[PDB]
């Protein structure tokens, strides 16, 4: 409980105006980890990292976005651009060679072509279709890409999630807030069909005098529906799947941020110790920020 004396010192400070001493007091609350904490934090970071890998693996177009760039640079008789470094580069537990890239892409094309028909069979929830999609995900997981392309890969997921969530919020922004749509039945009816106007006209079938005046807003409440359906068609993914992916990737990245935040301040003492030897060219406190 090192924070209890914080109240007994701050309420009894001399109100020192020196930034350095108050900053080093602020960073003095935390302790130093050794021989168990650092490995724990590394594991807590890597589990989040592979959770993000799983989140981006379930995206059906992720494999296509990985493969189409290398396919484009294949017809160039070689891949001289830096994106060849951003190839699959499988993890093992050096320059990219054709005997590696093409060998890894053979099973990628195989899964790309064999995971299409199985989904159509016995619906999306087909057991063999789901296990084949998971097999494609696993064969995607055997890679190790570069952070550069991975950044835009996750940014595409972020922007598509933002677009779909804004479209979903627009339903409330247009009618629920104005016409007072009761969310108690709204949430139940929305998750039922989400593809047609079954619940939309089921609301009209009920008494619902507020909903009876929906024709004037039909061409502005159904455009959101059309946008949602178009997004689902171009993505090939249902609302529940993408929502689950976003929900788990958010907590994974939050855990990763928490772990790295827990780890950073455990070496602020190292930073300030190493900053002392470099002073007086610029300052003492700016060097602290650069070290951080």
């Amino acid at each position: 409980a090192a924070a209890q004396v914080l109240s007994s010192v701050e309420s009894e400070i001399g109100r020192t105006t020196d930034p350095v001493r108050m900053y080093m007091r602020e960073m003095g609350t935390v302790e130093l980890l050794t021989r168990e904490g650092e490995i724990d934090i590394a594991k807590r970071i890597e589990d989040g990292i592979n959770q993000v890998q799983c989140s981006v693996a379930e995206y059906p177009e992720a494999i296509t976005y990985l493969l189409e760039q290398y396919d484009r640079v294949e017809a160039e008789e070689a891949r001289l651009s830096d994106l060849i470094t951003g190839f699959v580069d499988p993890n093992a537990e050096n320059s990219i060679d054709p005997e590696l890239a093409r060998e890894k892409f053979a099973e990628l094309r195989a899964q790309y072509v064999v995971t299409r028909d199985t989904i159509k069979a016995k619906g999306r929830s087909h057991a063999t279709a789901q296990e084949e999609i998971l097999k494609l995900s696993e064969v995607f997981k055997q890679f190790r890409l570069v952070p550069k392309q991975f950044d835009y890969l996750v940014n595409s997921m972020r922007v598509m999630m933002d677009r779909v969530r804004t479209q979903e919020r627009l339903i409330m922004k247009l009618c629920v807030e104005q016409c007072k749509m009761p969310k108690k039945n709204f949430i139940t009816l929305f998750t039922g069909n989400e593809t047609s106007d079954t619940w939309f006209n089921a609301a009209i079938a009920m008494n619902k005098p507020w909903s009876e005046k929906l024709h004037d807003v039909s061409e502005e409440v159904h455009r959101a529906l059309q946008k949602l359906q178009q997004i689902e068609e171009e993505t090939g993914l249902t609302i529940e799947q993408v929502k689950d992916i976003n929900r788990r990737m958010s907590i994974g990245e939050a855990k990763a941020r928490r772990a790295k935040k827990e780890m950073v301040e455990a070496n602020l003492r190292l930073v300030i110790s190493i900053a002392k030897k470099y002073t007086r060219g610029l300052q003492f406190l700016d060097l602290i920020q650069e070290g951080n």
Partner: protein, 99 residues
């Protein structure tokens, strides 16, 4: 002439140390404002419940207590942003007719 856009709002020094011109305007002690500017104590810009009140200084522990007790119902923060929000929330004519 030229200008530099400051990422975070910052406080003018003449209207802070000269005796206060913002201490009277906010009717707050100078020490409390100095503590707020140094990122040491929270300030409640507005509180929905009657437990808290506007312009009440806050230490971190009871600030976390308020967070767990209320959360988004009350509004409190630090820095020169807090002072700027305080100046924003003030209505001059009501104080003019009241005092």
């Amino acid at each position: 002439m030229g200008h530099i856009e400051l990422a975070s709002p910052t406080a003018h020094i003449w209207f802070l140390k000269s005796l206060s011109r913002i201490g009277l305007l906010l009717d707050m002690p100078l020490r409390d404002i100095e503590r707020v500017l140094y990122f040491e104590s929270y300030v409640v810009i507005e509180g929905g419940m009657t437990n808290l009140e506007r312009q009440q200084i806050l230490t971190e522990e009871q600030y976390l207590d308020a967070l767990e007790e209320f959360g988004d119902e009350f509004d409190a923060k630090m820095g020169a942003e807090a002072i700027q929000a305080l100046l924003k929330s003030m209505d001059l004519e009501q104080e003019c007719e009241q005092l």
